[PDB]
């Protein structure tokens, strides 16, 4: 399996985005990205793809051969979850 992860699908190669048989899409920020993101779908429609801009953290949109119809799923929070490796200015300014 090949899994493609990025944040600028509109600037990605068309064939790269089309090597998928199932889809799990999270939030995409910019409006201009939708111009080339409109091609991203293969077994969906436009009624559910218009609510990715407002998708909160942790949710996703899943459609493919494993689902009867597209659904918006609220994935549970992982336990344990990921950690961070970047500091904050306040910690350094404490001295």
């Amino acid at each position: 399996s090949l899994i493609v992860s990025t944040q600028r699908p509109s600037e990605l190669s068309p064939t790269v985005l089309a090597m998928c048989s199932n889809w799990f899409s999270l939030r995409l920020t910019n409006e201009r990205d939708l111009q080339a993101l409109r091609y991203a779908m293969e077994s969906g429609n436009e009624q559910i793809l218009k609510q990715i801009s407002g998708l909160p953290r942790g949710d996703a949109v899943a459609f493919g051969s494993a689902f009867n119809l597209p659904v918006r799923i609220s994935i549970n929070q992982a336990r344990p979850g990921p950690k961070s490796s970047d500091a904050v200015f306040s910690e350094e300014w404490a001295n």
Binding site: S21, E42, S43, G64, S65
Partner: protein, 102 residues
């Protein structure tokens, strides 16, 4: 319209009825006539399937009319192009495999 002892279907679409004429539904007897062949290719007909809305009337096609020019089968990826291709070419190309599929 009546021809000799049965009926026939024409495909002209500018004739309209008059005001006050009654309306009736179509029975299976009149549905058979609309989806038939021209009374002469019956011995040279192949059965494919049945209509969808009523699933009561069979469908037949002429051998000479089908395999005489370009034939196309369409579909979508991840939707059965392999599956539909296999099934349709199985049910269509059994008795006369002499056609060419490069």
């Amino acid at each position: 319209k009546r021809e000799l002892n049965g009926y026939v279907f024409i495909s002209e679409d500018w004739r309209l009825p008059a005001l006050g004429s009654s309306a009736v539904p179509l029975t299976s007897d009149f549905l058979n006539i609309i989806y038939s062949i021209d009374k002469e290719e019956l011995p040279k007909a192949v059965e494919l399937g049945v209509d969808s809305r009523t699933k009561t009337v069979k469908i037949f096609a002429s051998v000479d009319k089908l395999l005489s020019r370009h034939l196309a089968v369409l579909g979508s990826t991840g939707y059965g192009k392999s599956n539909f291709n296999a099934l349709l070419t199985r049910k269509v190309s059994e008795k006369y495999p002499n056609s060419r599929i490069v």
